[PDB]
């Protein structure tokens, strides 16, 4: 439903603020189910993302947990690198940041 | 395994060099870049320290090109002349020798290249392995010194001795002459006195009726090699008369002695030079960017640009990559072991060449195996083994020679 | 369409070619590689399986396109040069190839960002000739160049390889200062057949190489030029003589001759002072090393700016190095006969619009085919019953064209 | 801090020019380069604690410059122990604090340089962090990088200069004198000037030890009788068809090296002497040898840390740094500023100078004849002072060399506002 | 708001003491939150601030840290000494005490 | 002191009492910035802006007027600048070198001697303190005056029939 209602509301009628919450709960679930166990392990070693039982690590606070994660995927990734682009409408990383 | 399984594998290990360069000093902690993944991927393809993996093989690599009795169905003219899959069970051919290659992707990519604008000004031994072997078209924009085209024709028998005559006053006017440097081609006629003006043909030697010249600037010189040549005179008034030349190609008069930047191809017939006014002998230069004509690449690489014997040849600069191998050899004392190794392994390849299985008659080395430029000559000037044969085993000698050049690199036994 | 739009293309096919050479050799099976997964997705961009198709279903409809005055010309009017005006022109190539590509403003903040950079790539795209030569952009300020490149004709010299027969010949009594220059260093200085005396001796940096820096130069006495000797000049001294030094007017230091000190000066300063330690008969200064333009001084070379006299020697930006596949491809297919009849049409047709009144000015007949630039470069700018500016104009119009040229047709397979 | 430190972060910012130069028109609309998605995270890693990279880069290089300025700030970078040791050096500084940081992934980042040396092709033009490893160091260089002979130059007994010869070659000469070995760009020339002939025989030509590291591959070698395009006097180059062959040998192959072929050879002038027989008797003689050049293995610590010099004064190079240079000082000029960071240099200098002397103070007779960034020059006019030792001189070079290269490379995107 | 409440009143408006003491709450404020874990340490171990986990110290008075922090910072700590130079209205170190 | 904008350690009440900040910031600065630019800047300008330029090295306006002669200093062939009007005063023995001399509100350049000078192309070198100037509303003519002195050696002199005399 939230990804729906998405399409029928411009960015503006968000409060900028839940806008990136949005986002970031996004990047969780895609870390939290569709994340290898490798490619998780990787981000938190090079301290992009902090791991999924870190509850309190991933409350918001000014970043864009997503764009972080996209900005650091690698090439052989294909299942994320999808949700994120197709998520971000093309955008490239460097675009949606 | 087949010809092709030791290019694949070739390719694969000149990929990890490539890539190891693009990796020094842009290995820094927060980030995995995108050159690093491949570097640690094309490790995870050779069945934490890199080092450790591509050193191994090297040392396994050197046990196998050592010993005869196993890297002998390489030397057989089978080989290089087909890809038929070899009833060969050897450690070393299982673990890594394998096809590596995406097709028929990879091909169609390499096609698409010939034809892009800037190609890699030093390639790879890849491609030189490719023109060398199956006789395959180079980039037609790659660049290339012309004097390493250079191959002994009828009229004259070297490039680089001339030198030696071009630089003694003549007795009278002689026969024209065809030298080639790094970075442009001369050619001309020598007198002790006048030349009348008019025209005058130049016969363009097989060598270098290949060639092809882009930003040239074509002018009246009088050194070759930083040599001064006597017996022409480089001297002229803004007076003078305009001297123009011709080639079959382009129906326009190309400009001698002026500013402006010249293309016209090599590969028609003779050019046609208009000495506008009398020179006391006289020597032309065309110093540009020099390329080889498109499909034309076969001449060079498959050694049919040969015509004479003895002859002169250059060694397709496996000499420039085998300097690593060498260095990892001297520090290990095996440089000597190697070399009496390789003598043995040309000298069996040779051997399986000739009908009958046995050594040619007056066959004696002057150089190593590594010094390639030299003993392609001796086994180009055996008179009593058949020409196409002498052919055939200095371009399989020479894959055997690259392919040690590149899998040797990471050895260290101890 | 745009002229931006032209070129945002350009750079995007001259990138495939940049990318295609990273991928060859390096495509392999059961890995994926960050260069072929770009190169992949960036032919993606030109169809809105097999590149080849699409690559050369492009050229083929470029060259189909480029042929045609009727298509291709409003390409030729002085506007599209001047102007980022979008054109009212429907023609199904401009539609589905000619597109905005380059990311804005990012692409131009990198491109700025890089001539700060360390290390340039010493062989350019054409992009950068494209927007060097049409929108009068500045270069990196470390890429090196060829002095001789930067040549261009002045009131002592008409030119510079030419001056290499004079150069050559004994002379008759002390003359003029010489400037010339090579593929990897500049020399100047006075031949004579009797000595000159030692003391001071001013040379003016002539207006082409106002503009070129060394470094790591090498400053010597020689009587070499491209080879070719140099008479009236003495490489000869010794080791008691008397140090001779130069100076410019970028450095309050004098700059030492004849030592195994590597220099880095500017020429710039437009005057060079040298001072001749020990009397020689005639000499010849040496300065080989890396050379570069000056920052924000490439505007000169690239707007034909540099150019003062009529006739004028002029290289050709290199374009001739570029266009070699394209021409490889029209000799294996026969074309090469009907393609050059067709630009001497699109030459004709622009050279025109750039004239008031529309028609072509006597006196005009090339000496050489579309491809050899460099000289009709000359040509153009060598009719005196035709403003100078608008020479200039017409040589780097066509030029543009010229490049787009070598960049699209290369997939050329027409059959 | 540490000098590790100065240097992970000069690669970072080294590696940020490489990647913002592959990503110069290859940054498009739809297109997920992986190039510029590291040039992104580059950036990132400089301090955020963003759009316009030319910014934060930008207010980089202010800070720097500010830095450099200050004897008072930067003075921990001045003495000995700063170039000697890793010792974490406790001194807060803002900007060494925001930028001067640990960056290079250990033990990887080591491997993978050593695996470098050992591979095919490498860099023709290294960046300078190579250069930096090797003149601090003394780490080894990649065994395939080619380099200019002529720069591998040094001053050894018999000759004082390489360039100096070139006037004294080209002078005819009054008898038979000693041997000489200069060198080009591109190539290596040795031989005998005469003004009467030259006996057939064997020679002996000492291989001076600058050059005793060199290796050359492809090459071509002949008579000629030319030194940089300057002609050389009393040297014939003339020979005939029917002329008996001339060779020669290098203790390190066992076999002879042709001279005058179109053989394309390989050998190392890295052993002994190397032995010359002339065929037919010459009125003078001059061999080139005209190919790749490369340092042999292991062999660089002698170019790069000052160890093949022993005279005095000497011929010295400048590793490079007045390439890398140019940039900044197109900047400097840019904002009037040329003047003023040229007096701050002379200053830095004479400081540095200073610390690497007990007791601490400036050596009489030291007046530089150029400014900060003829590195070149000023490298002489300081391995020239004979009442200093010799061994303080080569550090005190060596030194003020890394931190000119760190002013090349930091101070690059300079502008004051 | 103090530090505004500071514009307008004069000196004579508050007790010797405390005009001192808010001094050091701000010196306070300044090592806590605008100080490196290296000019910190550098200033404990010379005895100018009283180490950081010293509450009651810090909140003892006869001891205008401030102009101590302020009369012992490096040429090299630019912030800091912008801070407190601005706090003190451009005085310097010396003149501030 | 002159060097650095480090502070002093100097306590003295004179300094205390009137010598510390005056100016806002950062805007006094991007006004004597956005100022160079300014179409009519002043003519006789404040210490200020020297003592900027002479210490900081910092931009003068663009269009500030100067007395060219003060720029001089001494170069090789001269050595000074008024010194030479006596020289330029003295009947030439043969044609002598360049000279390149400065007045308070003209440049002067020019080639002496007491036997005719040939029609042609002549390069000057302009020396390193006048390659700084720049001249707007010029009128570039022939004298045989400097600061009011005769220049002998010289004479301007033409008809409405010569050739055209330019420069580049």
Known sequence: ?97 | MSRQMWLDTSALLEAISEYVVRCNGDTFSGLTTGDFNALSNMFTQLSSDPRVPLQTMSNMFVSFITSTDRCGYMLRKTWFNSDTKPTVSDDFITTYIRPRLQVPMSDTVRQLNNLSLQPSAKPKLYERQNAIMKGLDIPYSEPIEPCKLFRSVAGQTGNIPMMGILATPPAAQQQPFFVAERRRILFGIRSNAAIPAGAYQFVVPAWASVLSVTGAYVYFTNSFFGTIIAGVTATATAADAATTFTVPTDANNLPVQTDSRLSFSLGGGNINLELGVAKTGFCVAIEGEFTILANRSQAYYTLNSITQTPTSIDDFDVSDFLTTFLSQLRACGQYEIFSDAMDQLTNSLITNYMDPPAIPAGLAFTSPWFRFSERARTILALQNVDLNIRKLIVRHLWVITSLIAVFGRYYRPN
Chains 1, 5 share one sequence.
Not at chain 1, 55 to 68: K, T
């Open chain 1, 1 to 97: 439903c939230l990804m729906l209602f998405q399409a029928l509301i411009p960015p503006s009628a968000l409060t900028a603020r839940q806008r990136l919450d949005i986002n970031n709960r996004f990047a969780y679930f895609l870390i939290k189910c569709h994340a290898t166990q490798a490619t998780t392990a990787r981000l938190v070693a090079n301290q992009v993302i902090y791991p999924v039982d870190a509850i309190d690590q991933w409350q918001s606070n000014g970043r864009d947990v997503l764009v972080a994660i996209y900005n650091n995927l690698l090439p052989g990734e294909l299942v994320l690198t999808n949700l994120i682009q197709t998520y971000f409408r093309g955008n490239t990383a460097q675009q949606a940041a």
